[PDB]
Amino acid sequence: GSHMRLNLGGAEVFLRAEGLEEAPGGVRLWGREVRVFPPFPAKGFFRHGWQSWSLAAWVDPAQAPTPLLPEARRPQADDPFLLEAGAWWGSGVGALRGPDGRALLLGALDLGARVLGREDLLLGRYAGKGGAWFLAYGPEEEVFAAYARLLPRRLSGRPPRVWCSWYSFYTRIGEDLLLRVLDEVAAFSFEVFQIDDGWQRALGDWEPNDRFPRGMAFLAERIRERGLRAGLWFAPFLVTADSPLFQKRPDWVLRDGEGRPVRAGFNWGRPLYALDAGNEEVVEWAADLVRKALAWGYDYLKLDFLYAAALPGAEGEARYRKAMARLREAAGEAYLLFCGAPVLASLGLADGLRVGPDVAPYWDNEERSFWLADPTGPGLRNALRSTLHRLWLMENVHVDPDVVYFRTRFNLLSPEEMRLQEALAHFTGFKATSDPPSWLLPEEKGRLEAFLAREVPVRRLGPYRFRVGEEEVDYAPLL
Amino acid sequence: GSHMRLNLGGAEVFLRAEGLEEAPGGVRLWGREVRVFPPFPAKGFFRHGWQSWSLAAWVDPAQAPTPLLPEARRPQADDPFLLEAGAWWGSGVGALRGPDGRALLLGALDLGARVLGREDLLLGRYAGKGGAWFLAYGPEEEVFAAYARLLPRRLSGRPPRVWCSWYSFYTRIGEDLLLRVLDEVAAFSFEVFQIDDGWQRALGDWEPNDRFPRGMAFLAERIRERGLRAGLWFAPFLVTADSPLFQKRPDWVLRDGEGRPVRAGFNWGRPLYALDAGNEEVVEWAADLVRKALAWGYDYLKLDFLYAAALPGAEGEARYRKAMARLREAAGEAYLLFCGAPVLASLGLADGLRVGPDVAPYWDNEERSFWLADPTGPGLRNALRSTLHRLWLMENVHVDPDVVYFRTRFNLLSPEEMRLQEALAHFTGFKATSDPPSWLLPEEKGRLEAFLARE
Amino acid sequence: GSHMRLNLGGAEVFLRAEGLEEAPGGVRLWGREVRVFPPFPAKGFFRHGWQSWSLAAWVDPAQAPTPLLPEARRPQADDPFLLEAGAWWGSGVGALRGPDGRALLLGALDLGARVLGREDLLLGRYAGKGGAWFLAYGPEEEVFAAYARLLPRRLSGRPPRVWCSWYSFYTRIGEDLLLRVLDEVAAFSFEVFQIDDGWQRALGDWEPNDRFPRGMAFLAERIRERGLRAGLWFAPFLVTADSPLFQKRPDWVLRDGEGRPVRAGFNWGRPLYALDAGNEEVVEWAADLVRKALAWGYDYLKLDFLYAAALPGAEGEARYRKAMARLREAAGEAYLLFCGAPVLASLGLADGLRVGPDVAPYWDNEERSFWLADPTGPGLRNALRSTLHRLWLMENVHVDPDVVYFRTRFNLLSPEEMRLQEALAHFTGFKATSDPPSWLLPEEKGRLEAFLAREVPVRRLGPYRFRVGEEEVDYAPLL
Amino acid sequence: GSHMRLNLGGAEVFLRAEGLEEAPGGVRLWGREVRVFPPFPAKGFFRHGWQSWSLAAWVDPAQAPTPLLPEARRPQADDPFLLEAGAWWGSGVGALRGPDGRALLLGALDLGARVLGREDLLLGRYAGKGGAWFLAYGPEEEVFAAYARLLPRRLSGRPPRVWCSWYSFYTRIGEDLLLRVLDEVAAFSFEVFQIDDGWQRALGDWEPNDRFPRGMAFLAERIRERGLRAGLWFAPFLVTADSPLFQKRPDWVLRDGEGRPVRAGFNWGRPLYALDAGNEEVVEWAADLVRKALAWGYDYLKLDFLYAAALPGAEGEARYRKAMARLREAAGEAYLLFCGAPVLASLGLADGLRVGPDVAPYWDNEERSFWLADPTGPGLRNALRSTLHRLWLMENVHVDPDVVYFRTRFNLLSPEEMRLQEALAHFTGFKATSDPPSWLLPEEKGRLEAFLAREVPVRRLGPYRFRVGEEEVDYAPLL
């Protein structure tokens, strides 16, 4: 569109958009594509990945991105377009960093956008119909804070204290086992007892397996009899080729223009497919999952693999938001923890939102992280990296940095490394763990409780420097 | 379009189409694209080829289709899209066969459609504007029968009895030769004496050559003086680069977006090009060929390589049907046999339609059928395979299974094999041969005559 | 080796050999590799294929040779080297023809040679042990007769008059069918009633199948009861994956330097493998098939696919010659017709030698001859082309042009076409047919008996022009 | 060579060799290449990897091997030829398995051999000059036992009980730390206190770093003052491009025919190179490493990355054996634990020999083991798999299955999985651990001591079934 000149944060910035109007802390550009030219040599670019597990960090715009591997796992790692492209594209928001500690930020305000990042240019482009942009230049923290002030929010009190069943037992869970654990956990200041993956029969067959013989509403009663809330995990729009649902209703599978199932990734040793979140019949089925779980007595719901409803990328954020609004509507005042979800497109609908790859009982799997060049895999390092770069969302949602480890048994993490993840739990206020109390030594059990029972004050000193209580925590070396 | 649920022939069929309504034998869908999901694990896909010579058979949708060779011959084998696509695509109609022997059938009701067969769905896509579909589940013969009822129809009584020149003399015909054969053919109970390829000077130069010195209208007179009807053969829209027409009116050649003549195959040792059947000057020139052949005294016309008027495939069936509707009316009540033609797109216009590759004096050319992976080449085996899967059209047109062999001289077919082709001629009722009576043994002369009487 | 100049045919010829000495009709060179330069521009090269079905014909050394397809059939087409190469290589003998109609010939006197033709030289090269060469310059028919004189010979009288079962019934033969055909064939002046392919259980299972219930010795006795010698067909060194012999004796299979079966073609719809003709155990198993047949009453034997024992080409001709030596001893005075055999390497061992591809009941399969560029397939033109360029071998073996057709039932050949083959059978003296008398019209049976019973005198006027009786026959149009 | 027929274990076996003579339990074939034909359809092939960490298992000869990845790590995974080749090649010994629980075994008796394995063939081939073979057919255990009875042995009493410093502290070791640990360990029935990688300054600079300030002979004195022997780790012939040795003496680097350093792999984040074990100067330098360590008071020596002296494969086993004999000669009666060493080529020289990949505090790294297709990486599974397939070496050397885990802290292995590795320690008698006693809970400390103090009886019930004490252990599911 039109060429335009601006005095943005005491600097002359040149842009092309079809419109412009003042806005709190910067300006509001319009147009289906807009280009912004930084008044400086750009030292770096804020590459924002599409979903929870995707990569969010500052990168070098000059050097080329590396292909992620295997190709089987690209749809569950990021917006497939951002991986496939040979330039540095980002989802929703991008930013260029001047040699002065200050950022030129271009952020969308509508669904379906991506932002290209060159050393000389910030290029915003909407996949579908055009929309609005927020542009701003200034200190790194202020512009991301000014941007987030223009996005939906659903801050609904403090974020609960959760015992998750995953980062211990993984899928190896059962009704007798979790009741034995529930008794241990009830002795601590938790607020939710959330059963994770493992209770269901298959993806799309969201009923209890034969390890949960008395049913899931029995388990939610035994949890509430302890003073706790009952939490449950779903992957609503995910299905595999061996699910009953995939074979009973083949018209519910998201398929491409040639009637082939859209590939959603590779997990549990088999290829993953999605359910079409544009099919109104399907969206009603997913909503009745929410009501069903609510009827069982569960007021905490971890909705997982949500990128499936948004495949294949920004294009699908349109259908994603509609479908998630119906789930949100069905949940009522229950708590929805979004996981593996398009980060920006879930604001306003999620009560709590995962902002990083899964933590793991180890610092980094070098073979996945380096040789396969896949920073979306589980690992404390890959968790922390995207999470520090999504903390500015704390004023729009509850930011889950994932579970905190206190155990040293069945866990390769070192104490100092565990404390790095613990500190983000204090900064975000999202305090969760999976450590069964049995696996905790006497000293570790006291630490778990002092973590749940106290509210530690925390001040942010810079991008990667924090003061929690009276200890100072730096994250600069990890990047 | 919207997602619909259907109880069709006792099964729960899920489909996606813009519109749905009741039809005889099943239901009728609307939409430029429609997707139907089989209520079973599909055991096979009915791949229906485009034109006369194309393959029509049940295939295994799991196995990837073999590329057809050589690439020069693809436009005269099939819809060139179906041969580039690495999935199983058919023309106009597709069906899936359940493990109970029944079939789920998706068939187009307007021009220019294709059907994709996987084991988990039938996808029908219109190349042009949207259109109607017929969907049905039942016995394999009844759903196809019920599909055929909803297509165009043109049944001109008993299909006539023809003597064709091609499958004995090929292009080595001439006036004095065919006068000598006429005299012996006239002793048998034929109805048409049809002259095939060999009388013309060039493709698009449809005037008699020097082996027919007295001309084509003279030869029509001599045929009618024996109580036979005169037949003549044309390839209206075909042309080679050495054709006078190719050089004198190059605006009549079908050209792609960059001005290059569209490739239409490789026959008679040369590359083949088409005339633009969208150019009303060409259709008129073609319609005048029909007029001239009636003028000469021919009232039976074999119109060949008709896929040329329908290039590049489904996308051309509009221009094709329109150009053929002109010839169909310049022919008046003359008999038109369509050959190498879009099968379903010809219905209602042709009196007779070839539904299989050429028969040949041999069972199968393994070098073309196997190593070149070309089932459209001549061969009694290739001819029977497509013909058998197109018999359901007998309610719409005269299904021509090609000529029947009675000779054993100059013919490698076994006696048992011949009886197959003869049997199909009885069933369709289209009785034609190409054998000079002088080549027949006394016993074969009797068998030919016993075959031409109709009972 | 040494550079040499000599005068030859009134021309000055330059050559490069280790030794030279005089000889009848030219000179004799010695050398593992010899080079000969024509003193003229070369208009044509004499490409000479390796085995019976291989192409022998004059070619333009300029144009590159076309790759023969499918690759699977190349070991049953020629020497696999000649086909993989991008120059014009021939087996054992080459020639260049100057614009004057004369020809410069270079021909091995030893095993395992190839000759290379450029417009400017003839290059001979022995694969194994270096050997002698014959170099001549003169009229085209002269040089070849001179060369034939310097090769092995084995003329066993007049070549017989054979009834071959192949080119009518193919593999559809059986004891009861052939017994009835025998009855009628015995009225004509035949000398051999040869049974072709179809009588055996499998390759390397050379024992009657269920279509010959009374055993092969019965048939042979009924054949001589009718005044006829009995002929049987064998592919001794040929075997398939599904042969019993292939699984029972894997040490008998010819394997390459890395333990893998050497591929020997593709026929009967299944890949073909060879037996190791340099294993005494195999060559003895083979000579016992000769013994077994002779014991059965047959003294005419058609030994087929004999290239299998000489794979992979020139290099194998040393094994081949020494194994065929054994079967020759084992046969005594019986008639051995070599088929698909290395042409030059069989001279002196074979009684009759097939020199072209199969005649067929048609002129040319354009799909195999042209699109696949395979001039070794059945077809009268392909048969005629090589046989005309191998007639100089009449000094050394009974030259077999394959069967003569007289029937018009079950035969696409024209009458003028069949007379071209019939003329060559007169010229070579090898008179055979497959026509069952049932299939012959009266006028046809008459011609067949005149063909057998008369000795039509025939003369040669040029390379492709003959005079059979008083009719002149010219084969130039096919070339 | 010659074709030969044999009655081997009540079966007729056909072979090609240049010689044959009877031998205990089978026969002794000769020849630089020999081929053996199994009297049955081969159901599987024993693929024996070259060195300690390489893969040793039964595989399907039909299916193709998969390329290992990254290519950077091929020289430290196996004989590079065995990886590069597209057939199933093995080092030294190979075997085909009949559908009857019995094996046709072809094993070399001289250095530098490889064995190809087809479904129809066992092909032995020497890289250099020819040599002797052992061939035998019979029960799986008997033929491998008969084979090993023909190879060098150096069984020198019971294998020591070792505290290794690696599988805890890895390189993070120091003099103050290990003295604090030495005090804990001395309370248990160990026999050797072995310091692992971490004490040196660089590869090739085999002197203590600044974390070992009082020197290594001080550490060996403090160890012996506890009643223990002092163990030390070297990687004698390994060097990196930043070592002083690599730059002070570039003529000691093993280089190819174009004077480029031979690549030895990728570890410690940098490319690895070898020292030329054919250089007599270098071999004397490595021997003075042995004497130096002996002079410091160390009578236990873990010699590591030994494949470097044998690069690039079988070809280099010639120089390897010479160089290792000089080290062996220098060590005297000290204990040499060979690690990462050519398995067969070290028999007779090693007192103890690693037979598998490193164990790890986890079952399997799927990303390295599957996507990179590299079964040489650390992991309990990949350790156990090659180790079960090299136990038949127990009568030639001490077979180290690597360290045994007793801790649950800083360790992801489950108890049942730990016990699988523990049982092989009882079967082999090589009892070692790295668990610092601090990291052990009271109950685990008792288990460590009962493991060192008792000698559990163990009987082998089948290939992967053992009875240790009175518990039965099956390994069939792991493969």
UniProtKB/TrEMBL annotation, chains A, C, D:
It comes from the Bacteria. Keywords: Glycosidase, Hydrolase, Plasmid. GO terms for biological process: carbohydrate catabolic process. InterPro entries: Aldolase_TIM, Alpha-glycosidase_related, GH, Glyco_hydro_36. The keyword Hydrolase applies. One of its GO terms (molecular function) is alpha-galactosidase activity. CDD domains: GH36. This is Alpha-galactosidase.
